[PDB]
Ligand binder design. Structure first.
Ligand code: CLA
Ligand code: CLA
Ligand code: CLA
Ligand code: CLA
Ligand code: CLA
Ligand code: CLA
Ligand code: CLA
Ligand SMILES: CCCCCCCCCCCCCCCC(=O)OC[C@H](COP(=O)(O)OC[C@@H](O)CO)OC(=O)CCCCCCCCCCCCCCC
Ligand SMILES: C/C(C=C=C1C(C)(C)C[C@H](O)C[C@@]1(C)O)=C/C=C/C(C)=C/C=C/C=C(C)/C=C/C=C(/C=C/[C@@]12O[C@]1(C)C[C@@H](O)CC2(C)C)CO
Ligand SMILES: CC(/C=C/C=C(C)/C=C/[C@@]12O[C@]1(C)C[C@@H](O)CC2(C)C)=C\C=C\C=C(C)\C=C\C=C(C)\C=C\[C@@]12O[C@]1(C)C[C@@H](O)CC2(C)C
Ligand SMILES: CC(/C=C/C=C(C)/C=C/[C@@]12O[C@]1(C)C[C@@H](O)CC2(C)C)=C\C=C\C=C(C)\C=C\C=C(C)\C=C\[C@@]12O[C@]1(C)C[C@@H](O)CC2(C)C
Lengths: 185, 171, 75, 162, 177
């Protein structure tokens, strides 16, 4: 491997996935369970060859990274003010805004909307398991167009996954610390 | 695996080799019983059977008889003992008449071979036929079996009465 | 309603009663329940036997639970 | 440590101290007999420990629910009958042991029907052996805990003496 | 091969291009259902009926809230609560409307099943063009697209109005401001 040199490799981390360095001490990328069956419990389709656990884990990692990046942006925003131009959003930090907004019937709306988007893109994941050429985390979302020049696309890929790992860990710290750089415990 | 098979590889017998008919536990348990224990004369088999049977027969008569006693009574024990002994006498009478009407043999495991070898052109059912080769299947064998049953029944009933008296008195 | 989503009818979802029965063999029971699905799908009398026996048992259970726990006002 | 039944996934042919690498077939049969008897007795002992703790209908209540205390409260004439019954059972087992084709722990005589054993039969025998081993460890722990602490299983757990 | 609406999804097999408003937005593959008497024909008929019903309901709510009720009818600006005021004083009107809608819906279901069986009637077609606004082709497709888009928007709008009236117990434009 290129990290943890005293372990050769998991088994499936050949390098076909971006941002691959070989770091997987527990060998989690070799579970034979096709996690698409957590969505569609049965084979359903006779053409459902199956999805490798590594590809499902890559999709989950990309989704986690995007969620964590947006989450740290939002949590940092509400520490330095920046409230929505509307009533009922006064100042109630981030450790308490979640509960008060769950009370005020709009976190349920956010849950519904996020679930709708998640269901559509999980249908995309299921089609990938069925055998579509779509790669993990690829929703073909390049509106501004900074995704051409394949070298730039690969660099931005590795950038997104590394930034997502950093943002996951940073959000874990921020939520655990209740923020120290911009507020108090 | 299958734990039920035809008995002794004969699919036409009215029997089966179940985990109860032909289990090792069944084999050993029935081979340690007096009726089938090897090395016992018919008198010994009868004596052991009578001892056990009188021993457990005195129980119900003494406990639930017409002369019970929640405390220990010599009259209750005597009544139970007499009832058990008379029941053993009735059983011995039944054994005697059964043996009288069933067998006509004095030495088995031979007559069968004699009539399978030296021919049996007679009235049959004594020379030929002969069900069972055990020593219990003879006139002499069953007579000694009944005698042993009767004597052992008396002795076992007396022993059980003594034990009941000791348990009721010293406990 | 939950129990009604058990047997496979028209989608790749649910159970096949044939596969359930045929898998319930044992050392003491030989082939087990193999062929019982064919018996109960080709004989009305077998279905009537099972249904009538369980139906009478259910009626007796109903009779017991009726007086045991009176379910109607002023009954 | 042979083709014997009882080898499971976590530690296949578990003989770290090499007790079986030098023993002959007779000693290994003795070891299997001892293991199976210990496992069965321990399963019975664990079940009795728990059930006695939360249910002792016999002896008109009394017979304190803590084991190792009811051990000294049974009339001691019921102890004799249990002892004699166990003795007669083991006499019958000894008589079984001389039957032809006897297998170490097989007192049902399954060798009469089971020639060319399957994988289900071996798996069930291994299940019995593993449950017996777990029950041996559990009953040893039960007795030791009750000795050192003085409380029974469900009593020590309920209080929180862990 | 990829759906026009969702580029990360393959083209839904049953939706080629024919129906107005078709952009390939079938992530769950509901167009491939062929059971319980439900297929693409039934789904399209249900969608068109929903579109028309939502358009009528949204237009009615907006009309009553903006221009007020007709003479002799109750007011209140809460369309989800004024229904009980109409029923409290004119129950016969509500009952007659319900009976008429029931008969028309029985006819609609019979027509849907028949047209599905002996294919001669497009889904949602009831030959209702009294003013001849869609006689010629090359305008019928545009009108179908307009109807489908307006009906989907009005479906969403009418569901929103129903939920707002049930929860807030206030008017639609009252909730707006
Ligand atoms: C993980 C993402 C995430 C989540 C869950 C939240 C959650 C919240 N934010 Mg928030 N925020 C985020 C990221 C996030 N933020 C980011 C990245 C920014 C910077 C741009 C902000 C800036 C921000 C401000 C300025 C304010 C909030 C506020 C709030 C709170 C009120 C909103 C509410 O009740 O739910 C409403 C429902 C949701 C938030 C669910 C999101 C559903 C979206 C809208 C669906 C569409 C997503 C979008 C299209 C994604 C595109 C990707 C793909 C389609 C291509 C709530 C706790 C307000 C507050 O009072 O907080 C204390 C407030 O004033 N946030
Ligand atoms: C409520 C509607 C809804 C629905 C239907 C989905 C549907 C989906 N989400 Mg999802 N999601 C939603 C809301 C929703 N999301 C919201 C509001 C968030 C923000 C908190 C997320 C954050 C999120 C992440 C970060 C991930 C998903 C993933 C998934 C997919 C797999 C889900 C699974 O296996 O069971 C989920 C069942 C669980 C019990 C969740 C696991 C919880 C873990 C074990 C514990 C973590 C700490 C708590 C599926 C497409 C995963 C995916 O795409 O995998 C490829 C994935 O990685 N979602
Ligand atoms: C090693 C096994 C073992 C031993 C030594 C004891 C010992 C004792 N038990 Mg006990 N018990 C056991 C297992 C055991 N138990 C199991 C497995 C159960 C669950 C059914 C119970 C349930 C139980 C209750 C409910 C009670 C006792 C009680 C008692 C005490 C009085 C004796 C009595 O009435 O027993 C009664 C025993 C039974 C009713 C069940 C025994 C069934 C045996 C163990 C199985 C068959 C044995 C068979 C003859 C030999 C196996 C054949 C083959 C494998 C070779 C005594 C300390 C009493 C007491 O005072 O509690 C404090 C009491 O009320 N036990
Ligand atoms: C063959 C039948 C038989 C008979 C007649 C008895 C008779 C008796 N047993 Mg007993 N017992 C038997 C078989 C039998 N046992 C077997 C097979 C076992 C299993 C090992 C036991 C285990 C047993 C225990 C554990 C106890 C008795 C006790 C008793 C006595 C009291 C019973 C009673 O209700 O009071 C009349 C009584 C002398 C009890 C006793 O003697 O205490 C005073 C007692 O504690 N028995
Ligand atoms: C009372 C008489 C009556 C009768 C017999 C019918 C008969 C019919 N209607 Mg109908 N309808 C009626 C009154 C009636 N309607 C009224 C008063 C309205 C409101 C103005 C509607 C609005 C309506 C719509 C919008 C639709 C129908 C549809 C149908 C057909 C499908 C029936 C079915 O399987 O539903 C089963 C019954 C159900 C209640 C299932 C629906 C459950 C959904 C999920 C409820 C969702 C609620 C959420 C908030 C059938 C011809 C459908 C159709 O033609 O499809 C081709 C269709 O899409 N109807
Ligand atoms: C889904 C379609 C729909 C439904 C269910 C209703 C239902 C209703 N409308 Mg209505 N309306 C609609 C579309 C609809 N409207 C449209 C499209 C318009 C604009 C042309 C109107 C304009 C309108 C006015 C101006 C009034 C109503 C009124 C009413 C109520 C009593 C009349 C009645 O029983 O209707 C059936 C009536 C006939 C068949 C005639 C009733 C709750 C009255 C009311 O009480 O409002 C508060 C009233 O004054 N509506
Ligand atoms: C069709 C488009 C559409 C439009 C323009 C609106 C517009 C509005 N809705 Mg709304 N809504 C819609 C669809 C729509 N909705 C749908 C489809 C549903 C689900 C059936 C809802 C369910 C809904 C609820 C439950 C509530 C609103 C509320 C509101 C108002 C507050 C907006 C806001 O962000 O508050 C945040 C606003 C006038 C709120 C309101 O009336 O505020 C007082 C409110 O409580 N809406
Ligand atoms: C009750 C005994 C019981 O049901 O144990 C269950 C025992 C186990 O049999 P099997 O393992 O072969 O059953 C497996 C399948 O047939 C499932 O039914 O069945 C019998 O041996 C029937 C003998 C009845 C003897 C009556 C006493
Ligand atoms: C078998 C069948 C028909 C058929 C067939 C045939 C005949 C065999 C022919 C074919 O061959 C096959 C088939 C299947 O088509 C089935 C019939 C259909 C059903 C089962 C009818 C259901 C209609 C229910 C509706 C549409 C009710 C809506 C309720 C509303 C309430 C309105 C409110 O204002 C109220 C009252 C209170 C207010 O506070 C607020 C709200 C809540 C908004 C909105 O409107
Ligand atoms: C532990 C953790 C991450 C641990 C990472 C580790 C050890 C990584 C170690 C390594 O990298 C190094 C060091 C070096 C590498 O070479 C080797 C490895 C091994 C790879 C994240 C926790 C992450 C923990 C998280 C994210 C917990 C979040 C909790 C939240 C957000 C709570 C939200 C609330 O809603 C509630 C629940 C209630 C509301 O009332 C209030 C609020 C607060 C709003
Ligand atoms: C069903 C109906 C009304 C139903 C109303 C109901 C149930 C309401 C009931 C309630 O309010 C009450 C009572 C009391 C409340 O407490 C309870 C409810 C339940 C709220 C009206 C039909 C009304 C039906 C009408 C008006 C029919 C008119 C028919 C015409 C003109 C026919 C003409 C033709 O027949 C010729 C002449 C020649 C033919 O060849 C051609 C044609 C054209 C077909």
């Amino acid at each position: 491997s290129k990290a943890v040199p005293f372990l050769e490799a998991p088994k499936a981390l050949d390098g076909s996935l971006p941002a691959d360095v070989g770091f997987d001490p527990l060998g989690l990328s070799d579970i034979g369970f096709d996690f698409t069956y957590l969505m569609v419990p049965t084979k359903w389709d006779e053409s459902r060859t199956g999805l490798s656990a590594l590809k499902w884990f890559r999709e989950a990692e990309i989704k986690h990274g995007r969620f964590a990046m947006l989450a740290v942006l939002g949590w940092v925003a509400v520490d330095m003010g920046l409230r929505l131009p509307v009533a009922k959003y006064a100042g109630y930090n981030a450790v308490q805004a979640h509960d008060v907004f769950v009370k005020s019937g709009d976190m349920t709306v956010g849950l519904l909307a996020i679930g709708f988007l998640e269901v559509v893109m999980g249908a995309a994941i299921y089609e990938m398991s069925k055998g579509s050429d779509r790669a993990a985390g690829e929703f073909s979302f390049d509106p501004l167009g900074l995704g051409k020049d394949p070298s730039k696309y690969a660099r931005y890929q590795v950038s997104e996954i590394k930034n997502g790992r950093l943002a996951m860990l940073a959000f874990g710290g921020i939520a655990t610390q209740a923020v120290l750089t911009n507020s108090g415990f | 695996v299958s734990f039920i098979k035809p008995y002794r590889q004969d699919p036409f017998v009215g029997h089966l080799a179940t985990p109860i008919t032909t289990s090792a536990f069944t084999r050993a348990y029935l081979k340690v019983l007096p009726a089938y224990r090897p090395g016992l004369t018919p008198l010994s088999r009868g004596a052991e059977i009578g001892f056990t049977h009188g021993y457990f027969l005195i129980g119900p008569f003494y406990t639930y008889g017409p002369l019970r006693s929640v405390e220990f009574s010599l009259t209750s024990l005597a009544a139970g003992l007499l009832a058990a002994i008379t029941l053993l006498l009735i059983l011995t009478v039944g054994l005697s008449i059964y043996g009288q009407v069933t067998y006509d043999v004095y030495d088995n495991a031979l007559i069968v071979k004699l009539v399978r070898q030296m021919v049996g052109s007679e009235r049959t059912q004594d020379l030929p036929q002969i069900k069972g080769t055990s020593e219990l299947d003879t006139v002499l064998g069953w007579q000694k079996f009944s005698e042993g049953f009767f004597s052992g029944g008396l002795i076992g009933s007396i022993v059980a009465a003594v034990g009941i008296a000791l348990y009721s008195t010293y406990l | 309603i939950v129990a009604g989503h058990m047997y496979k009818t028209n989608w790749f979802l649910g159970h096949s009663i044939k596969t359930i029965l045929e898998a319930h063999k044992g050392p003491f029971t030989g082939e087990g329940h193999k062929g019982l699905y064919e018996v109960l799908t080709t004989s009305w009398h077998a279905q009537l036997a099972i249904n009538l026996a369980l139906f009478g048992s259910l009626s007796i259970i109903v009779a017991h639970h009726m007086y045991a726990m009176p379910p109607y006002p002023y009954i | 440590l042979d083709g014997m039944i009882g080898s499971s996934a976590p530690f296949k042919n578990f003989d770290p101290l090499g007790f079986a690498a030098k023993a002959d077939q007779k000693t290994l049969n003795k070891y299997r007999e001892s293991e199976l008897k210990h496992g069965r007795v321990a399963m019975l002992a664990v079940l009795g420990w728990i059930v006695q703790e939360f249910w002792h209908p016999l002896y008109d209540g009394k017979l304190s629910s803590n084991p190792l205390k009811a051990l000294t409260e049974v009339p001691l004439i019921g102890w004799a009958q249990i002892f004699v019954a166990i003795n007669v059972i083991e006499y019958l087992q000894n008589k079984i042991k001389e039957l032809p084709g006897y297998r170490p722990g097989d007192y049902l005589g399954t060798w009469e029907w089971v020639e060319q054993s399957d994988e289900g039969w071996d798996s069930y025998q291994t299940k019995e052996l593993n449950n017996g081993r777990l029950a041996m460890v559990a009953i040893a722990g039960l007795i030791v805990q009750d000795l050192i602490t003085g409380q029974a299983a469900l009593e020590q757990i309920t209080a929180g003496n862990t | 091969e990829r759906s026009k609406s969702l580029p990360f999804l393959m083209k839904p097999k049953n939706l080629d291009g024919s129906m107005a408003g078709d952009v390939g937005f079938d992530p769950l593959g509901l167009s491939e259902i062929n059971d319980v008497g439900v297929d693409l024909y039934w789904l399209r008929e249900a969608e068109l009926k929903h579109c028309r019903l939502g358009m009528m309901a949204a237009a009615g709510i907006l009309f009553v809230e903006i221009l007020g009720p007709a003479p002799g009818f109750p007011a209140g600006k809460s369309q989800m609560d004024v229904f009980w005021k109409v029923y409290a004083e004119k129950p016969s009107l509500i009952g007659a409307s319900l009976a008429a809608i029931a008969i028309l819906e029985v006819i609609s279901g019979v027509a849907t099943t028949q047209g599905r069986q002996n294919g001669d009637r497009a889904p949602g077609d009831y030959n209702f063009d009294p003013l001849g606004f869609g006689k010629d082709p090359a305008k019928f497709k545009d009108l179908q697209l307009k109807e489908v888009k307006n009906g989907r928007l009005a479906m969403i709008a009418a569901a929103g109005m129903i939920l707002q009236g049930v929860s807030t117990h206030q008017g639609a434009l009252e909730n707006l401001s």
